[PDB]
CSV table of C-alpha atoms in Angstrom, one decimal:
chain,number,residue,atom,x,y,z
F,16,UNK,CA,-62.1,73.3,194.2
F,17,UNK,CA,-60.2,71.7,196.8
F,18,UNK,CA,-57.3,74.5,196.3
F,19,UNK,CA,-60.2,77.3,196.7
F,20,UNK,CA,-61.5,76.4,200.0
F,21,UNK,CA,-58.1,76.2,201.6
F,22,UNK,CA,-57.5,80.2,200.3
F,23,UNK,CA,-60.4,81.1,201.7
F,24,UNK,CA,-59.5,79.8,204.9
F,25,UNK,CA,-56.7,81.4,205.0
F,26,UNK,CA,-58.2,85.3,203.3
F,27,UNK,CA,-61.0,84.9,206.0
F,28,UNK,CA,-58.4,84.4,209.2
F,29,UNK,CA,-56.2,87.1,208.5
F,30,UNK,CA,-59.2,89.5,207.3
F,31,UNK,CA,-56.8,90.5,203.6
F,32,UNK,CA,-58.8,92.4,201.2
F,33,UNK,CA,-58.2,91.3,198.0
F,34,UNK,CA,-60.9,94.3,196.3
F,35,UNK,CA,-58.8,95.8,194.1
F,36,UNK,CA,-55.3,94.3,194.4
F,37,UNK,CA,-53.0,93.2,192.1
F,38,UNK,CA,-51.9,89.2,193.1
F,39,UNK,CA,-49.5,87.0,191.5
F,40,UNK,CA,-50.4,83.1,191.9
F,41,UNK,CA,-46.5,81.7,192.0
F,42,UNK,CA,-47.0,78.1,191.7
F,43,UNK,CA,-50.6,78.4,189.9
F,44,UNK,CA,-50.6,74.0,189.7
F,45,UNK,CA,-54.5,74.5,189.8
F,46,UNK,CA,-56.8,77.3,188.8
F,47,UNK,CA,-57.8,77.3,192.2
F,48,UNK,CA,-56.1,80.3,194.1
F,49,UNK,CA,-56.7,82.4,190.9
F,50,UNK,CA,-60.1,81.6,190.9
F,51,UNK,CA,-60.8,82.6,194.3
F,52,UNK,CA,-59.1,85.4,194.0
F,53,UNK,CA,-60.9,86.6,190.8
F,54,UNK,CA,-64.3,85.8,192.7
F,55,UNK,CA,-63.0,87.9,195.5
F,56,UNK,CA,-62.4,91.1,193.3
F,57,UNK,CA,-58.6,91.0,192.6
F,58,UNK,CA,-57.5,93.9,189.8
F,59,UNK,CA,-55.3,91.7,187.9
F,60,UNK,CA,-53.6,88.0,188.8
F,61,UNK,CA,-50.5,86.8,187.5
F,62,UNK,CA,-50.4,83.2,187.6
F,63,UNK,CA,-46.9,82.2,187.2
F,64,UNK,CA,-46.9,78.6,186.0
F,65,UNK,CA,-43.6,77.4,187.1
F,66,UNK,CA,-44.0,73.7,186.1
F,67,UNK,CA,-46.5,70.7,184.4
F,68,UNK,CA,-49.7,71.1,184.3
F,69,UNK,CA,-51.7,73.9,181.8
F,70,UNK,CA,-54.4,76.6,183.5
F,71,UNK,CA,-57.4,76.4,181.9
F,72,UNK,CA,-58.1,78.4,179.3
F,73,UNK,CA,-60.7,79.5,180.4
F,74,UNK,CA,-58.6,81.2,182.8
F,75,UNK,CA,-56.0,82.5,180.8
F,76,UNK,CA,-58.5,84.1,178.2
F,77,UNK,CA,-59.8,86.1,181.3
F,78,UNK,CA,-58.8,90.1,180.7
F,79,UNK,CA,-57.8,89.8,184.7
F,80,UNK,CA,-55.4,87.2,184.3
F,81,UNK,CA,-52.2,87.3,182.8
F,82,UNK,CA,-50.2,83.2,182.6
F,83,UNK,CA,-46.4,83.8,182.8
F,84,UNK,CA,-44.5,80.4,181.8
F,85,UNK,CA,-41.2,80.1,183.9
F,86,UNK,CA,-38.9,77.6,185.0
F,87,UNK,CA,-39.0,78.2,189.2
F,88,UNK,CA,-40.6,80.7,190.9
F,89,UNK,CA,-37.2,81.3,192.3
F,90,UNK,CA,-36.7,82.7,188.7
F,91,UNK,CA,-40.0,85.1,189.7
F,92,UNK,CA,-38.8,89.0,188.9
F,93,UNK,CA,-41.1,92.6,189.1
F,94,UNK,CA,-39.9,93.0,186.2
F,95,UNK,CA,-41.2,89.8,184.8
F,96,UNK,CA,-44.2,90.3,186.3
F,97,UNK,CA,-45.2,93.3,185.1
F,98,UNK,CA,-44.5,95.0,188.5
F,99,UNK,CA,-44.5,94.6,192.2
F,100,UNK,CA,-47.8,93.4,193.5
F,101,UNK,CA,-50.4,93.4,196.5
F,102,UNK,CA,-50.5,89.9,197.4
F,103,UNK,CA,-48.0,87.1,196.9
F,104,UNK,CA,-49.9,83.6,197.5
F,105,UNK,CA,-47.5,80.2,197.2
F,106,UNK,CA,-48.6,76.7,197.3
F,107,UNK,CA,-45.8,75.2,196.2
F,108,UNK,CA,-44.1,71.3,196.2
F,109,UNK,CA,-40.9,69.9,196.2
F,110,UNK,CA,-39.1,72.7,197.4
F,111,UNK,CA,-38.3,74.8,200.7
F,112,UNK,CA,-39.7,78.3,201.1
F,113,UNK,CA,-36.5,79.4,202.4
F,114,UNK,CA,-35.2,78.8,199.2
F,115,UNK,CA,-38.1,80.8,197.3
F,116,UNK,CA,-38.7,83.4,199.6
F,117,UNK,CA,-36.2,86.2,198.4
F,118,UNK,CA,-38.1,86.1,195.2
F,119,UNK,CA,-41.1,86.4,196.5
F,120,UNK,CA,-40.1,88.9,198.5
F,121,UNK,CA,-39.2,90.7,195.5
F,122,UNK,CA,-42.1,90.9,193.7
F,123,UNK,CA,-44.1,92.3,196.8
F,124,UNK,CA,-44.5,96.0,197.5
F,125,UNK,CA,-43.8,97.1,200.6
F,126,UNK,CA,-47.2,97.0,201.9
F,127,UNK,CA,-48.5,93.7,200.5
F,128,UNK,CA,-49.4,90.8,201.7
F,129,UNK,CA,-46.9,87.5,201.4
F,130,UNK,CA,-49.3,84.4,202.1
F,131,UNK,CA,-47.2,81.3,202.0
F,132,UNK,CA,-48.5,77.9,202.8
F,133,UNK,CA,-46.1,75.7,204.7
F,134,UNK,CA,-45.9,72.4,204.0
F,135,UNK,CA,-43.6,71.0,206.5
F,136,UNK,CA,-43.4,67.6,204.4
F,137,UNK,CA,-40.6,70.2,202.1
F,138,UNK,CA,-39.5,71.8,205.3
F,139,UNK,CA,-38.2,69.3,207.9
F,140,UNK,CA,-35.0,67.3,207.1
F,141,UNK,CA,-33.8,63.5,206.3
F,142,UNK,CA,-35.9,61.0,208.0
F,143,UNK,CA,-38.0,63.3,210.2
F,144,UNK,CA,-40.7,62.3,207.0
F,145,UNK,CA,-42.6,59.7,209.0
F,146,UNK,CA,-44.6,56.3,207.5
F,147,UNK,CA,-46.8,57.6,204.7
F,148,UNK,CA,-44.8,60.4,203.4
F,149,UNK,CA,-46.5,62.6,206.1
F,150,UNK,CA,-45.1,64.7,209.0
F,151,UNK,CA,-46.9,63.3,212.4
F,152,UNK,CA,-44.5,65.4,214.8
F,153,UNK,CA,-46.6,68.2,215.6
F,154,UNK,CA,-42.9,69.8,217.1
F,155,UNK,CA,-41.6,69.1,213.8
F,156,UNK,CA,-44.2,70.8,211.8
F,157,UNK,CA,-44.2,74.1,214.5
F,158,UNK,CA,-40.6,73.8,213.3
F,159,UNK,CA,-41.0,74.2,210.1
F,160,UNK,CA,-43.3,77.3,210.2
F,161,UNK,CA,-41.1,78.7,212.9
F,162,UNK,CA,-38.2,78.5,210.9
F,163,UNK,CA,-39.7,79.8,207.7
F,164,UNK,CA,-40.9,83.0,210.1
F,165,UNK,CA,-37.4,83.1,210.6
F,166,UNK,CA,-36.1,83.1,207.5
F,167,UNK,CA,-39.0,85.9,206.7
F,168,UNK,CA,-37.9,87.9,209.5
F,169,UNK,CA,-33.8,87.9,208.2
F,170,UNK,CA,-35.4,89.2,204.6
F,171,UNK,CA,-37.2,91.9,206.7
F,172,UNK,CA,-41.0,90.3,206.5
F,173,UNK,CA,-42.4,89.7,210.2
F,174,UNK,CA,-45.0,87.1,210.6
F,175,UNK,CA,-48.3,88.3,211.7
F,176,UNK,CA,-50.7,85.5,211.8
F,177,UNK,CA,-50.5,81.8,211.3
F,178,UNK,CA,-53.5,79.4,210.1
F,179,UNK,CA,-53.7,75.4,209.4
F,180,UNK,CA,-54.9,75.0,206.3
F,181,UNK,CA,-58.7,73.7,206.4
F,182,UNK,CA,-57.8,70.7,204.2
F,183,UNK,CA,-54.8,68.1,204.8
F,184,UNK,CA,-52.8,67.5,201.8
F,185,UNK,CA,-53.8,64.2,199.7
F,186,UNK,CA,-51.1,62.0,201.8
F,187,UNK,CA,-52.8,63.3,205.0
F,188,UNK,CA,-49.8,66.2,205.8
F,189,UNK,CA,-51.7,69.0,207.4
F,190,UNK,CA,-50.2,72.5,206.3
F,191,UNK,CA,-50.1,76.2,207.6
F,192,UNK,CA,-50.5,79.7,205.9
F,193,UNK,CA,-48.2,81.9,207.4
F,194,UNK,CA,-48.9,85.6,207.2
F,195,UNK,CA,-46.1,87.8,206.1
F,196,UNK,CA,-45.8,92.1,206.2
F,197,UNK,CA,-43.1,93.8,206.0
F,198,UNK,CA,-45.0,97.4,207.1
F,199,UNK,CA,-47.2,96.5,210.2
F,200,UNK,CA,-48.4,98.0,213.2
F,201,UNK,CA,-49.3,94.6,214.4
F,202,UNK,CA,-46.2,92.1,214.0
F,203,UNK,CA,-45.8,89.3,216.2
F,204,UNK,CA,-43.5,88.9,218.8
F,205,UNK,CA,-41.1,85.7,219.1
F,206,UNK,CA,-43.8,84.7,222.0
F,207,UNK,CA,-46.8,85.8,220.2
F,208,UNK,CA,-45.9,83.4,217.0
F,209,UNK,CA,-44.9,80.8,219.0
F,210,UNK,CA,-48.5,80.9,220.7
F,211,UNK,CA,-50.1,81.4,217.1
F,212,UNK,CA,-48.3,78.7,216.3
F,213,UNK,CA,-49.3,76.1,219.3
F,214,UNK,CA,-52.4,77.1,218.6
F,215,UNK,CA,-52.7,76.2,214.7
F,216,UNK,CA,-51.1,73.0,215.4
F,217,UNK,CA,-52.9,71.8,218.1
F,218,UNK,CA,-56.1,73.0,216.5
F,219,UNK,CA,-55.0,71.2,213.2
F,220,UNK,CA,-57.1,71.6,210.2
């Protein structure tokens, strides 16, 4: 799975344990980062589908897993969930994680883990989308994870680590997990995630 070896990526850069933790999956468009987790010893997974395409059932049949249907996962709630949760992982299209984040946010206990991937392709604004639908301003795409730490930060989550996904997305865009804490002995400061940052980008996937 393509969507597998880019959680991994991210799981084995910022050293999260997922042994044991409740997860929710809130844009679960393939069974990939439930998968993954599940391998990787997660409690219980809620994959929130939050638009087309069905998780296998396979998947769904699994006693870990629990499928909630929803329109956005800005509609994402504890209570819908069945409670806050350990880890909050978001691949998501089409929309901003500035947007989303509050929900997130509010399904997370206070010391999860919030994992979002950045795709700066949703993130930058009109016509900074260059020839092919991609992002090719490396300044544009620190940007956009810069200002999603920022808009983190405001909801009370400081970044603590960021990594470029180890696959590009199909049109080419390379993207970037961004790790989120809100109880951390070891959040970033403005200069130490605008290194971690440089770094990612110029490192690319």
């Amino acid at each position: 799975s393509r969507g597998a070896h880019k959680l991994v990526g991210a799981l084995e850069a910022f050293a999260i344990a997922v042994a044991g933790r409740r997860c929710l999956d809130a844009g679960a468009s393939t069974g990939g980062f439930t998968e993954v987790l599940l391998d990787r010893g997660a409690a219980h997974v809620v994959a929130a589908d939050v638009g087309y395409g069905q998780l296998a059932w396979s998947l769904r049949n699994d006693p870990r897993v629990v499928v909630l249907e929803r329109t956005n996962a800005r509609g994402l709630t504890p209570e819908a969930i069945g409670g806050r949760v350990d880890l909050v992982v978001a691949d998501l299209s089409f929309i901003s994680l500035a947007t989303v984040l509050p929900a997130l946010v509010g399904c997370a206990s206070r010391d999860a883990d919030i994992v979002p991937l950045v795709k700066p392709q949703f993130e930058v604004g009109k016509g900074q989308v260059g020839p092919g639908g991609v992002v090719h301003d490396p300044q544009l795409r620190a940007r956009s994870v810069l200002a999603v730490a920022r808009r983190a930060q405001e909801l009370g989550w400081h970044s603590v680590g960021v990594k470029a996904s180890p696959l590009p997305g199909p049109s080419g865009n390379v993207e970037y997990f961004l790790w989120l804490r809100t109880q951390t002995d070891r959040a970033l400061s403005a200069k130490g995630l605008e290194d971690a940052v440089h770094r990612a980008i110029s490192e690319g996937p």
